[PDB]
């Protein structure tokens, strides 16, 4: 396969990317949500799709296992984006990185413990507020951590706030806005520009 | 809540732990698989259950957010087990950590690239075979990596081998056997032994 490999994740990124792909002449031939398969052809024989965990999208793209991909800004910040090119803000899967804690709970008298999957972002954010914190790395369900006393605050993505409210948590600080971004492998950009360019141009047009 | 908090993960660990818990006088009051909730009461008011991602079970237990938990040996090896006590091999969720690659593909002429979530285990295993390797950290779907040239081999858990065979991969090396283990917080063991002891004794009896 000499064409382009596009890395996407299931759920909202796949759902919100499909219209952009359609407008660019690229449609999946089945629903990846209902398949155990991971590589999918498209209506365009020069483009195939990898379905990955969101956290693996930057990894595949960086290493050139995919030529390009759609990754949340949150994942990019956490992973590090210095070995891919971020070409477009697609303005999909929009949310924000925030700190949160138990509603009205005071902070304890010591170095704070932050429970989060976004360990690098958490460290950098608290450092920008003048604080060195301990970070506890979690892989899921951040909202539970404050309720059982694992960490004093969490760092997580918030959209509606329903998850925080359902668990008696409140957002404390706004870290940054997050949206999904189009990222490209630095070599693929140079060597497969002829294939990439119309798709990138289509995406840019669609997001206007 | 002054009783015991038990950390479990969904799927096979929950499924294979429930009979042990039943025999110990502990039953869930609903199916956690069909709930968004994360804390669950049991038939015993001294015991509640946290449902966590498997990789977070050791974390919660180590930190004392749970008093005890059931974690796969694979997760324990990767996370590090020096700040919990491993008390029982429950002999559930039995599988093995293995290396795997594309069937009959020769190794390349350079330092190997291992794609895996088990980065510490991979490093230690290849070091025991006389090799320093590069490790690429992945969070899911290891089987895809060799097929798109991300890494030369993977390290993953294998049971039937169906996943490897479905993807044209073959197991190369047997790293170790894996089963789920009962782990306890080092302080909880000391301070809540009266609550723990009958449950531990019941589990031990059940697994005989
Ligand atoms: N509630 C939300 N609303 C909008 N965007 C979100 C929301 N939650 C996460 N996102 C964004 O969408 C991306 C897709 O990730 P997601 O499908 O939740 O997978 P994962 O659970 O593996 O992070 C996230 O990395 C983030 O940028
Ligand atoms: N196919 C399998 N058969 C038996 N045990 C398995 C299998 N796959 C994983 N396991 C074991 O069961 C544990 C439960 O993890 P699992 O439910 O697969 O969650 P995750 O996908 O987050 O690792 C694993 O950490 C491992 O020890
Ligand atoms: O502010 P809200 O609108 O509640 O969104 C916040 C939640 O959205 C995401 O969950 P997702 O829907 O991806 O489910 P999961 O992360 O629990 O799998 C994220 O992990 C937060 O928990
Ligand atoms: O040798 P096998 O019998 O095929 O088992 C191996 C597979 O089992 C586990 O997958 P699981 O069923 O937990 O699904 P997931 O890891 O893809 O979520 C593991 O992640 C392997 O992919
Ligand atoms: Mg999610
Ligand atoms: Mg699994």
Curated annotation (Swiss-Prot), chains A, B:
It comes from the Bacteria. InterPro entries: ATP_PRibTrfase_cat, ATP_PRibTrfase_CS, ATP_PRibTrfase_HisG, ATP_PRibTrfase_HisG_short. It holds the Pfam family HisG. Pathway: Amino-acid biosynthesis; L-histidine biosynthesis; L-histidine from 5-phospho-alpha-D-ribose 1-diphosphate: step 1/9. It is an enzyme of class 2 (transferase). GO terms for biological process: L-histidine biosynthetic process. One of its GO terms (cellular component) is cytoplasm. Its main location: cytoplasm. Its EC number is 2.4.2.17. GO terms for molecular function: ATP binding; ATP phosphoribosyltransferase activity. It is found in: Cytoplasm. It catalyses: 1-(5-phospho-beta-D-ribosyl)-ATP + diphosphate = 5-phospho-alpha-D-ribose 1-diphosphate + ATP. PROSITE patterns: ATP_P_PHORIBOSYLTR. Keywords: Amino-acid biosynthesis, ATP-binding, Cytoplasm, Glycosyltransferase, Histidine biosynthesis, Nucleotide-binding, Transferase. Heteromultimer composed of HisG and HisZ subunits. Lacks the C-terminal regulatory region which is replaced by HisZ. Belongs to the ATP phosphoribosyltransferase family. Short subfamily. Catalyzes the condensation of ATP and 5-phosphoribose 1-diphosphate to form N'-(5'-phosphoribosyl)-ATP (PR-ATP). Has a crucial role in the pathway because the rate of histidine biosynthesis seems to be controlled primarily by regulation of HisG enzymatic activity. PANTHER family: ATP PHOSPHORIBOSYLTRANSFERASE, ATP PHOSPHORIBOSYLTRANSFERASE ATP-PRTASE. This is ATP phosphoribosyltransferase. It comes from Psychrobacter arcticus (strain DSM 17307 / VKM B-2377 / 273-4).
